[PDB]
């Protein structure tokens, strides 16, 4: 049931000082701690993607590189997760992260992913409710080796930031939700990303893709929608982080300027 629905345009913007995360799980208070890790560099070129479905294949798969900074100002129901892997078909393993209103499912199988994958919602007349289907995300999922169900991390103007790293067997996800007063989507200032999950995956990830949710029309089978998101790439960089009295990273310097 793989259908091509999403077209995507891209512009380039400034990261400013976004993308800082807690590099370990150690409480530090009122110190300057210098750490060398995969960080999003300050004032780096970040790609702003606008993905539009109106009611051909123009939604390519992005590289993963050394890790991905992801940001979105959209609501929690439009962008519903991500796809990670190398070939994104049945010959290699892949990682699927899907959020819905109640929980998140993170699941590593041999998915035969569609070229334009999207979670579609549709009303079911026997269940008498709007259900969600992954049959437009993949056509099959076999030899499935990991599953993790937990509370969702796309919940409810609100800027949602994620950092994905794939380091020595573990898929590390860091996240932060920041209420941004109406203005520039990527704001100034600092908001450190707290460690959200470390997943013992142990797969090869070189490419990634964002999952959108599309609604059936009931009035060109799907309702027209738009999703804007920012992608930046992590680099091995040395940062000097300021930990204040309560253990919060309130400041950092990127050591190239």
């Amino acid at each position, epitope marked *: 049931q793989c259908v091509n629905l999403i077209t995507r345009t891209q512009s380039y913007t400034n990261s400013f000082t976004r993308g800082v995360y807690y590099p370990d799980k150690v409480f530090r208070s009122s110190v300057l701690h210098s750490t060398q890790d995969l960080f999003l560099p300050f004032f780096s070129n970040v790609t702003w993607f606008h993905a539009i479905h109106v009611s051909r294949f123009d939604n390519p798969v992005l590289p993963f590189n050394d890790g991905v900074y992801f940001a979105s100002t959209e609501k929690s129901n439009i962008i519903r997760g991500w796809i990670f892997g190398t070939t994104l078909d049945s010959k290699t393993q892949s990682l699927l992260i899907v959020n819905n209103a109640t929980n998140v499912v993170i699941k590593v199988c041999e998915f035969q992913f569609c070229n334009d994958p999207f979670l579609d919602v*549709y*009303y079911h*007349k026997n269940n*008498k409710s709007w259900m969600e289907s992954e049959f437009r995300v993949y056509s099959s999922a076999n030899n499935c080796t990991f599953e993790y169900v937990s509370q969702p991390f796309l919940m409810d103007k609100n800027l949602r930031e994620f950092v994905f790293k794939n380091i020595d067997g573990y898929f590390k996800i860091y996240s932060k939700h920041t209420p941004i007063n109406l203005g520039r989507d990527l704001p100034q200032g600092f908001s450190a990303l707290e460690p959200l999950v470390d997943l013992p995956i142990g797969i090869n990830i070189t490419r990634f893709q964002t999952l959108l949710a599309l609604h059936r029309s*009931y009035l060109s*089978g799907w309702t027209a929608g738009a999703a804007a998101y920012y992608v930046g790439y992590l680099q091995p960089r040395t940062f000097l982080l300021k930990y204040n009295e309560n253990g919060t990273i309130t400041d950092a310097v990127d050591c190239a300027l």
Partner: antibody
Amino acid sequence: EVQLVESGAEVKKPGASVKVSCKVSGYTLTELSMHWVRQAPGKGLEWMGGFDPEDGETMYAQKFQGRVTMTEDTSTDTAYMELSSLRSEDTAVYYCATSTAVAGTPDLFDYYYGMDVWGQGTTVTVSS
Amino acid sequence: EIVMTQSPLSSPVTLGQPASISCRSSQSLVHSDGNTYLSWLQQRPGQPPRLLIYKISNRFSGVPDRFSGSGAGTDFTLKISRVEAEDVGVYYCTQATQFPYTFGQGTKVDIK
């Protein structure tokens, strides 16, 4: 847009089942209320029965209860209709009609009732 | 069971002149959802009926702007602003509120 295609016309001696099919496309069969309407020649077209989006699933006409059964195959997206005990008055053109079960967004949706998209008719004739 | 009455049975209309078809229900078609469900269907000889108008006056997709619906409660009308050579055939009004769904006896519109 929903597109409906039909099965073939048939003739059968009375006392055996009739298999009238309707294949949907564009929308799958679980998003659609499905109805079946009979038209005898020289008479107005009358409703045999169909889906109820609330307070039950399937309703039948009072003059077709005990004969008509309608089955839905989600895998092939086909609405089948069967009726036993054919009579000589049953020589008629059979229409499969359909509608969306709801209308609106997932946040705001309401139940819809009616017969919007009609397929081609299948002529069921009962003779010797 | 809701019985429908059509009026008049056959209406000879010249080309382009407006034609009015009355649909009447012996029971009020107000549904608990708030909407009232009456639809106006057109049938040509050798062709299945197609939905002209759903929900009193809303136009279905692909329907020209010469078909209008009006009325409420128990009194409904279909008004055709221009009659052309493609408008010959039998017109029906149907309800969808109370089961069983019923249909009118049909009105035949011709040219001469």
